[PDB]
């Protein structure tokens, strides 16, 4: 691979990539440009233990496996010239590159109807966001969440534990409409409702007036704070300007190659093939950020290595629910292991397509999740009666 | 650009590309691999004048502006090795390349429910298809068309003119669901119905038994021949196998670059940015095939040339209706010029979005189409009252 290496973005995907470059044996220059003036850190605690307990030194990413990297923190890459092989920085400097890696992630989507709001409206992506929101998470305050996705629901649980009244507006009929089985989504709504979350389905925010939010059904919700969690948009502006193929995300193959020679991309900023669906998708999971970063680095140092091939999965910690989801949300059959109950929730879902496992969910059942991911990866076709039988040991079965 | 040049596919996009390479001044080797054993030819007459009059020598593409090209006709490219820079051919030979261009187009989608049918079921894409279908286009025979898109409707008109009884099954509520304003689609249904086409909306074919087609509504249609026109699938298998980013189409930027260095793609096989919608789409128009091919070639020979930038448009000749459509099918406003009538049809539609022209349709009104495409290209915001006023001259206005 061509030195020097320059990475744009200093999130999980970037850190994972540069650590793997070093581990795989690349000893040339690596320079990382990160617009946040923060020691690189992991985002999931921002909706949970950080939001609750406030210690950022418990959430930093370990860069020790990435020795001899210059991290330019608090600096924004403004453009790159793919012919000159240079990157223009906000501090006035220019970096040369042999290989450029775009790991710029994604930014929260804003709600146009709250654009000119005069009440506190925040999104939750950065340490700065978390600190700002947390400052207003006072007991008996009223929090309104817009969006029924995982970030909002993680925040909902954390806020309720802090004694914050929580209302949530979801424009669709169900929570977690993206990459979650309906059976899971239905249960998760039941759980949050039972914890005091005031859920509003099939409602959209139409605007706001002096501390009160307005909805499509002509009604009102007053709140001390709105946190908007309606998804993210890829940070692909530099790629678009430089002539790379992008569409809310930079298109890459399994080697992380963009359409521009010597420019790669990885993490949340990418649109890539989901091997289960066979379609291109923006995969915005923590596991993708890390594993795609590692795979792209490994193949750069050793071109005989295979391309990225991992199947997608994530977790979401929502109060008492430790949720794990792998693969596709549905197939032609769902198998349920255990009872689906608010009384000490513990259950496993298995999605199949023509007898083949194409997805799985575990709630408070991590022991089963790893063997199911192994079964999923090889497209296993186990006996559906055995899969249902609670007598069955999935770990054993995966062999 | 790097010699030698090898192009896979010998359709309109390929011919247009190689002619532009030569015209722009590239004098190195060009070899084109075409799986059809046919002198390169244009496809639109296959649903019209060829289907009716049968002379293939009236439909060949002019390769005269492409001198010194070796056309390997009747040969299939089976794979390419992007590291070795070679292409493996079905006749046992291998071609070396400096630059590889994938212009392999798309193939008609098959209908799974007719997979094991015992009655004649054809698609219409090639000269061989056309000849085969035409052999059965006997007066008073009964033709069933599956799909409400342009190819089927063009065939419907040609068949009706030949005295063939025509029934058509469309799974959606309207014809031309892709890239046609609803106002146009509604009128086109009225026209075909008035010409004797038996239109069946919101019906799907569920199967067939001994010369009779079965539908989702539990009913039957008997026919002497079925022509299936339910869209196409990109011929991107070689790209997928070689590790390029694809998803029913090869992703390319405005230079025609794929994710693989030294490999380009153009025409029906590509997924590319539509500058009006700002989204990636497979654009399967004749004008795209030609203009994208020309643009990619021009930039290969002269890297200072801009990338492909044309806005999409097509025509469709359906009996008495000469239809032209440019840009987006809808905006926040449609302006109608003229009466929409089966009595000597002649009218123009203009789609606007926040005052800006984003699309237009002309039916039997070619004079207006060129100035509207010029207005469209520059994002014109004309006075909506003037646009409506039939006193207005659009050609004048476009200046
Ligand atoms: C609140 C929260 C909770 C989460 N919880 C979960 C969870 O329960 N499960 C799960 O699977 N995932 C969770 N995620 C974590 C998530 O999946 C990862 O953070 C993400 O996938 C990492 O991707 P990334 O490194 O590509 O992007 P990012 O983390 O966004 O990093 C990209 C960095 O590049 C910066 N950048 C952008 N443009 C430029 C530029 N021009 N110059 C320099 N820098 C630039 C960005 O500002 C950013 O700092 C959560 C995320 C959040 C925000
Ligand atoms: C019946 C019909 C009517 C039409 N009428 C209209 C119309 O009214 N308006 C309009 O805008 N467009 C019309 N189109 C025309 C159309 O838009 C063009 O034909 C098309 O866009 C050309 O794209 P192409 O050159 O990329 O692909 P193609 O024409 O499909 O050419 C690709 C060629 O590559 C070959 N190939 C594939 N794989 C390999 C391989 N491994 N090795 C070698 N060769 C390979 C294919 O077989 C094919 O011959 C019509 C098409 C048809 C079929
Ligand atoms: N996966 C995780 O997803 C995290 C981030 O995304 P997120 O939690 O903020 O959102 P999300 O997981 O993508 O889901 C967000 C919710 O907002 C809704 N939504 C999307 N666009 C909207 C709009 N324009 N107006 C109103 N609602 C809209 C979505 O519902 P719909 O599906 O109905 O659009 C969805 O319910 C990633 O970090 C990753 O961890
Ligand atoms: N544009 C032109 O389009 C030409 C070729 O495409 P075409 O005319 O054959 O098709 P098309 O223009 O893409 O439209 C085909 C019709 O078939 C329908 N269809 C798609 N998939 C189907 C399925 N699985 N089962 C039943 N119906 C289905 C589509 O309706 P839906 O939109 O409802 O899918 C559409 O009405 C190109 O050559 C180009 O000239």
Coordinates of C-alpha atoms in Angstrom, one line a residue, chain B:
Chain B
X1 CA -5.6 6.8 -20.7
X2 CA -4.0 3.3 -20.7
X3 CA -3.9 1.2 -23.8
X4 CA -5.2 -1.2 -24.9
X5 CA -8.9 -0.6 -24.4
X6 CA -11.3 -3.5 -24.1
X7 CA -15.1 -3.0 -24.0
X8 CA -17.5 -5.7 -22.9
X9 CA -20.8 -5.5 -24.6
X10 CA -21.6 -4.2 -28.1
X11 CA -24.8 -2.3 -27.7
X12 CA -25.5 1.4 -28.1
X13 CA -23.5 2.4 -25.1
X14 CA -20.5 0.5 -26.3
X15 CA -20.7 1.8 -29.9
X16 CA -21.2 5.4 -28.6
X17 CA -18.2 5.1 -26.3
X18 CA -15.8 3.7 -28.9
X19 CA -16.8 6.2 -31.6
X20 CA -16.1 9.0 -29.1
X21 CA -12.7 7.6 -28.2
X22 CA -11.7 7.7 -31.8
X23 CA -13.3 11.1 -32.4
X24 CA -11.5 12.5 -29.4
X25 CA -8.2 11.4 -30.7
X26 CA -7.4 8.1 -29.1
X27 CA -5.5 5.9 -31.6
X28 CA -4.5 2.9 -29.6
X29 CA -6.1 -0.6 -29.7
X30 CA -9.8 -1.0 -29.1
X31 CA -11.4 -4.4 -28.9
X32 CA -15.1 -4.9 -28.3
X33 CA -16.5 -8.2 -27.1
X34 CA -20.2 -8.8 -28.0
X35 CA -22.1 -11.9 -27.0
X36 CA -24.8 -11.5 -29.7
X37 CA -23.7 -12.7 -33.1
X38 CA -25.2 -9.6 -34.7
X39 CA -23.8 -6.5 -36.4
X40 CA -24.4 -3.9 -33.7
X41 CA -28.0 -2.7 -33.8
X42 CA -30.4 -0.3 -32.1
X43 CA -33.2 -1.8 -29.9
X44 CA -36.1 0.7 -30.1
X45 CA -37.3 -0.5 -33.6
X46 CA -37.7 -4.0 -32.1
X47 CA -41.1 -3.0 -30.6
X48 CA -42.1 -1.0 -33.6
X49 CA -41.0 -0.8 -37.3
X50 CA -38.9 -4.0 -37.1
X51 CA -41.7 -5.9 -35.3
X52 CA -44.0 -4.7 -38.1
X53 CA -41.7 -4.8 -41.2
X54 CA -38.8 -7.1 -40.4
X55 CA -35.7 -5.6 -42.0
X56 CA -32.7 -5.7 -39.6
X57 CA -30.6 -3.8 -42.1
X58 CA -32.6 -0.7 -41.3
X59 CA -31.6 -0.8 -37.6
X60 CA -27.9 -1.3 -37.5
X61 CA -25.7 1.2 -35.5
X62 CA -23.3 3.2 -37.6
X63 CA -19.8 2.2 -36.6
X64 CA -18.1 4.4 -39.2
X65 CA -17.0 7.0 -36.6
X66 CA -15.3 4.1 -34.9
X67 CA -12.6 3.1 -37.3
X68 CA -9.9 0.4 -36.5
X69 CA -12.0 -1.4 -33.9
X70 CA -12.0 -5.2 -33.7
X71 CA -15.5 -6.4 -32.9
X72 CA -15.5 -9.9 -31.5
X73 CA -19.2 -10.8 -32.2
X74 CA -20.8 -13.9 -30.8
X75 CA -18.2 -14.1 -28.0
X76 CA -19.0 -14.0 -24.3
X77 CA -16.6 -12.5 -21.7
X78 CA -16.7 -15.0 -18.9
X79 CA -14.5 -13.3 -16.3
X80 CA -11.8 -10.6 -15.9
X81 CA -8.8 -10.5 -13.6
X82 CA -8.3 -6.9 -12.5
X83 CA -4.9 -7.6 -11.1
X84 CA -3.5 -9.4 -14.2
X85 CA -5.5 -7.0 -16.4
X86 CA -6.9 -9.7 -18.6
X87 CA -10.3 -10.8 -19.8
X88 CA -11.2 -14.5 -20.3
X89 CA -13.4 -15.2 -23.4
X90 CA -15.8 -18.1 -24.2
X91 CA -13.8 -19.0 -27.3
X92 CA -10.8 -19.8 -25.2
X93 CA -8.8 -16.7 -25.9
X94 CA -7.7 -14.0 -23.4
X95 CA -7.5 -10.3 -23.9
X96 CA -5.1 -8.0 -22.1
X97 CA -6.2 -4.5 -21.1
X98 CA -4.9 -1.2 -19.9
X99 CA -8.5 0.1 -19.5
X100 CA -11.5 -2.2 -19.3
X101 CA -15.0 -0.8 -20.0
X102 CA -18.1 -2.7 -18.9
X103 CA -21.0 -1.9 -21.2
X104 CA -23.0 -5.1 -20.8
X105 CA -26.4 -3.6 -20.4
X106 CA -29.3 -5.5 -18.8
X107 CA -31.5 -8.5 -19.4
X108 CA -35.2 -8.9 -19.1
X109 CA -36.5 -10.1 -15.7
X110 CA -38.2 -13.4 -15.9
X111 CA -41.6 -14.1 -14.2
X112 CA -41.1 -16.9 -11.6
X113 CA -44.8 -17.9 -11.8
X114 CA -44.4 -18.7 -15.5
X115 CA -41.1 -20.6 -15.0
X116 CA -42.5 -24.0 -16.0
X117 CA -45.1 -22.8 -18.4
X118 CA -45.8 -25.0 -21.5
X119 CA -47.2 -22.2 -23.6
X120 CA -45.1 -19.7 -25.6
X121 CA -43.6 -17.1 -23.1
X122 CA -41.1 -14.6 -24.5
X123 CA -39.3 -11.4 -23.4
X124 CA -38.4 -8.6 -25.8
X125 CA -34.8 -7.4 -25.7
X126 CA -32.9 -8.8 -28.7
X127 CA -33.2 -9.2 -32.4
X128 CA -33.7 -12.9 -31.8
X129 CA -36.6 -12.2 -29.4
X130 CA -38.2 -9.8 -31.9
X131 CA -38.0 -12.3 -34.7
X132 CA -39.4 -15.0 -32.5
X133 CA -42.3 -12.9 -31.3
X134 CA -43.0 -11.5 -34.7
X135 CA -43.4 -15.0 -36.1
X136 CA -46.4 -15.4 -33.8
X137 CA -47.9 -12.0 -34.4
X138 CA -50.6 -13.4 -36.6
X139 CA -53.8 -11.4 -37.2
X140 CA -56.6 -12.4 -34.8
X141 CA -54.1 -14.3 -32.5
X142 CA -54.3 -13.4 -28.8
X143 CA -51.4 -11.7 -27.2
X144 CA -51.1 -11.3 -23.5
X145 CA -48.6 -8.7 -22.2
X146 CA -47.3 -8.9 -18.6
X147 CA -46.1 -5.5 -17.3
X148 CA -47.3 -1.9 -17.9
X149 CA -44.0 -0.4 -18.9
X150 CA -42.9 1.2 -22.2
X151 CA -41.7 -1.9 -24.0
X152 CA -45.0 -3.7 -23.5
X153 CA -47.1 -0.7 -24.4
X154 CA -45.0 -0.1 -27.6
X155 CA -45.6 -3.7 -28.5
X156 CA -49.3 -3.4 -27.6
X157 CA -49.7 -0.6 -30.2
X158 CA -47.7 -2.5 -32.9
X159 CA -49.7 -5.7 -32.3
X160 CA -53.1 -3.9 -32.4
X161 CA -52.1 -2.3 -35.7
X162 CA -51.4 -5.8 -37.0
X163 CA -54.8 -7.0 -36.0
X164 CA -53.6 -8.9 -33.0
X165 CA -56.0 -9.0 -30.0
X166 CA -54.1 -7.6 -27.0
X167 CA -54.7 -8.1 -23.3
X168 CA -52.3 -6.5 -20.7
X169 CA -51.8 -7.4 -17.1
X170 CA -50.3 -4.6 -14.8
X171 CA -49.7 -5.4 -11.2
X172 CA -50.0 -1.8 -10.1
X173 CA -52.9 0.8 -10.4
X174 CA -51.2 2.6 -13.4
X175 CA -49.1 2.1 -16.5
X176 CA -45.6 3.5 -16.8
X177 CA -45.2 3.6 -13.0
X178 CA -41.5 4.4 -13.6
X179 CA -40.5 7.9 -14.6
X180 CA -43.9 9.1 -16.0
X181 CA -46.2 11.7 -14.5
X182 CA -49.5 10.3 -13.3
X183 CA -51.4 12.6 -15.7
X184 CA -49.5 11.0 -18.6
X185 CA -50.0 7.5 -17.3
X186 CA -53.7 8.0 -16.9
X187 CA -54.0 9.4 -20.5
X188 CA -51.9 6.6 -21.9
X189 CA -54.3 4.0 -20.4
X190 CA -57.2 5.8 -21.9
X191 CA -55.6 5.8 -25.3
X192 CA -54.7 2.1 -25.3
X193 CA -58.2 1.1 -24.0
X194 CA -59.7 3.1 -26.9
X195 CA -57.5 1.1 -29.3
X196 CA -58.9 -2.2 -28.1
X197 CA -56.3 -3.2 -25.5
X198 CA -57.9 -5.2 -22.7
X199 CA -56.2 -3.6 -19.6
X200 CA -56.1 -5.4 -16.3
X201 CA -54.9 -3.3 -13.4
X202 CA -53.7 -4.5 -10.0
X203 CA -53.5 -8.0 -11.2
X204 CA -50.5 -10.4 -11.0
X205 CA -49.9 -13.6 -12.9
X206 CA -50.0 -16.5 -10.4
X207 CA -49.3 -19.3 -12.9
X208 CA -50.5 -21.0 -16.1
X209 CA -52.2 -24.2 -17.3
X210 CA -52.3 -25.5 -20.9
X211 CA -52.5 -22.2 -22.8
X212 CA -54.3 -20.2 -20.1
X213 CA -52.8 -17.7 -17.7
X214 CA -53.9 -17.4 -14.1
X215 CA -54.2 -14.3 -12.0
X216 CA -54.1 -13.2 -8.3
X217 CA -57.8 -12.5 -8.4
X218 CA -58.6 -16.1 -9.1
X219 CA -59.4 -15.5 -12.8
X220 CA -58.1 -16.6 -16.2
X221 CA -56.9 -15.2 -19.4
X222 CA -56.2 -17.5 -22.4
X223 CA -53.6 -16.4 -24.9
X224 CA -51.7 -17.8 -27.9
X225 CA -48.5 -16.0 -26.6
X226 CA -47.3 -14.2 -23.5
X227 CA -44.7 -11.4 -23.8
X228 CA -43.2 -10.6 -20.4
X229 CA -42.1 -7.0 -19.9
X230 CA -41.6 -6.5 -16.2
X231 CA -38.3 -4.6 -16.3
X232 CA -34.7 -5.6 -16.5
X233 CA -31.8 -6.8 -14.3
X234 CA -28.3 -5.4 -14.8
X235 CA -25.8 -7.7 -16.5
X236 CA -23.2 -7.1 -13.7
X237 CA -22.1 -10.7 -13.0
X238 CA -18.5 -10.2 -14.2
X239 CA -18.2 -7.1 -12.0
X240 CA -19.7 -8.8 -9.0
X241 CA -17.3 -11.8 -9.3
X242 CA -14.2 -9.5 -9.8
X243 CA -15.0 -7.6 -6.6
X244 CA -16.6 -4.3 -7.9
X245 CA -19.3 -2.5 -5.9
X246 CA -22.7 -3.6 -7.5
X247 CA -26.3 -3.8 -6.5
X248 CA -28.4 -4.7 -9.6
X249 CA -26.0 -2.4 -11.4
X250 CA -22.4 -1.3 -11.2
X251 CA -21.9 1.8 -9.2
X252 CA -20.1 4.5 -11.1
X253 CA -19.2 8.2 -10.6
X254 CA -19.5 10.9 -13.3
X255 CA -16.3 9.7 -14.9
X256 CA -17.7 6.2 -15.3
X257 CA -15.2 4.9 -12.7
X258 CA -16.1 1.7 -10.8
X259 CA -14.6 0.8 -7.5
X260 CA -11.9 -1.1 -9.3
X261 CA -8.9 0.8 -10.7
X262 CA -8.7 0.8 -14.5
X263 CA -12.3 -0.6 -14.8
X264 CA -15.1 1.7 -16.1
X265 CA -18.8 1.0 -16.7
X266 CA -21.5 2.8 -18.8
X267 CA -25.0 2.4 -20.0
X268 CA -27.8 0.2 -18.8
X269 CA -25.4 -1.8 -16.6
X270 CA -24.7 1.2 -14.3
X271 CA -26.1 2.8 -11.2
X272 CA -25.3 6.5 -11.3
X273 CA -26.3 9.8 -9.9
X274 CA -29.4 11.5 -11.2
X275 CA -28.5 15.2 -10.8
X276 CA -32.2 16.2 -10.4
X277 CA -33.1 13.8 -7.6
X278 CA -29.5 13.7 -6.3
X279 CA -30.0 9.9 -5.8
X280 CA -28.3 6.9 -7.5
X281 CA -30.5 5.2 -10.0
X282 CA -30.2 2.7 -12.9
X283 CA -31.0 5.0 -15.8
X284 CA -32.0 2.8 -18.7
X285 CA -32.8 5.3 -21.4
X286 CA -31.4 5.4 -24.9
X287 CA -30.2 8.9 -24.4
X288 CA -28.2 7.8 -21.3
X289 CA -26.6 4.9 -23.2
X290 CA -25.3 7.3 -25.9
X291 CA -24.6 10.4 -23.8
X292 CA -23.0 8.6 -20.8
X293 CA -20.9 6.6 -23.3
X294 CA -19.7 9.7 -25.0
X295 CA -19.0 11.6 -21.8
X296 CA -17.0 8.8 -20.3
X297 CA -14.9 8.4 -23.4
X298 CA -14.3 12.2 -23.7
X299 CA -13.0 12.4 -20.2
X300 CA -10.8 9.4 -20.6
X301 CA -9.0 11.0 -23.6
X302 CA -9.2 14.5 -22.1
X303 CA -9.2 14.5 -18.3
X304 CA -9.9 18.2 -18.2
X305 CA -13.3 17.5 -19.7
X306 CA -16.2 17.6 -17.2
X307 CA -17.9 14.4 -16.0
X308 CA -21.2 13.2 -17.3
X309 CA -23.8 15.8 -16.4
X310 CA -26.8 15.3 -18.7
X311 CA -30.3 15.3 -17.2
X312 CA -32.4 12.2 -18.0
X313 CA -35.0 12.0 -20.7
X314 CA -36.6 9.5 -23.0
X315 CA -39.3 9.1 -25.7
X316 CA -41.8 6.3 -26.3
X317 CA -43.7 5.9 -29.6
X318 CA -47.0 4.2 -28.8
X319 CA -49.1 4.1 -31.9
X320 CA -50.6 7.6 -32.5
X321 CA -48.8 8.9 -29.3
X322 CA -45.4 10.3 -29.7
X323 CA -44.4 10.7 -26.0
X324 CA -41.4 12.6 -24.7
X325 CA -40.5 12.8 -21.0
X326 CA -37.7 14.7 -19.4
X327 CA -36.6 14.9 -15.8
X328 CA -38.6 14.1 -12.7
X329 CA -42.2 12.7 -12.9
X330 CA -43.5 15.1 -10.2
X331 CA -42.7 18.1 -8.1
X332 CA -45.0 20.3 -6.0
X333 CA -46.9 21.6 -9.1
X334 CA -47.9 20.4 -12.6
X335 CA -48.7 22.9 -15.3
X336 CA -50.8 21.6 -18.3
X337 CA -50.5 23.2 -21.7
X338 CA -53.3 22.3 -24.1
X339 CA -56.3 20.0 -23.7
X340 CA -55.7 16.4 -22.7
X341 CA -58.0 14.6 -25.2
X342 CA -58.2 11.4 -27.3
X343 CA -59.4 13.6 -30.1
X344 CA -56.1 14.4 -31.8
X345 CA -53.9 14.2 -28.7
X346 CA -51.5 17.1 -28.3
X347 CA -50.3 18.5 -24.9
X348 CA -47.4 19.5 -22.7
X349 CA -46.9 18.9 -19.0
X350 CA -44.4 20.9 -16.9
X351 CA -43.4 19.7 -13.4
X352 CA -42.1 22.3 -10.9
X353 CA -40.6 22.2 -7.5
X354 CA -40.6 25.6 -5.6
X355 CA -41.0 27.4 -8.9
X356 CA -38.2 25.6 -10.6
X357 CA -38.8 23.3 -13.6
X358 CA -37.8 19.8 -12.7
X359 CA -39.5 17.8 -15.5
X360 CA -41.6 18.0 -18.6
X361 CA -43.7 15.9 -20.9
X362 CA -44.8 16.4 -24.5
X363 CA -47.3 14.3 -26.4
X364 CA -47.3 14.9 -30.1
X365 CA -45.5 18.2 -29.5
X366 CA -41.8 17.8 -30.2
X367 CA -41.5 21.5 -31.0
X368 CA -41.9 22.3 -27.3
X369 CA -39.7 19.5 -25.9
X370 CA -36.3 20.9 -26.8
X371 CA -36.8 24.3 -25.2
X372 CA -38.3 22.7 -22.1
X373 CA -35.2 20.5 -21.8
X374 CA -33.0 23.6 -22.0
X375 CA -35.2 25.3 -19.3
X376 CA -34.9 22.1 -17.2
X377 CA -31.1 21.9 -17.5
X378 CA -30.5 25.4 -16.0
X379 CA -33.2 25.0 -13.3
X380 CA -35.3 27.9 -14.8
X381 CA -38.0 29.5 -12.7
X382 CA -40.4 31.0 -15.3
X383 CA -43.6 32.8 -14.5
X384 CA -46.1 30.0 -13.9
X385 CA -48.9 32.1 -15.5
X386 CA -46.8 32.4 -18.7
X387 CA -46.0 28.7 -18.6
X388 CA -49.8 28.0 -18.6
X389 CA -50.7 30.7 -21.2
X390 CA -51.0 29.0 -24.6
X391 CA -50.1 32.4 -26.0
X392 CA -46.6 31.8 -24.6
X393 CA -43.8 30.6 -26.9
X394 CA -41.6 28.3 -25.0
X395 CA -38.7 28.5 -27.5
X396 CA -38.7 32.2 -27.1
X397 CA -39.0 31.9 -23.3
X398 CA -35.9 29.7 -23.2
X399 CA -33.9 32.8 -23.9

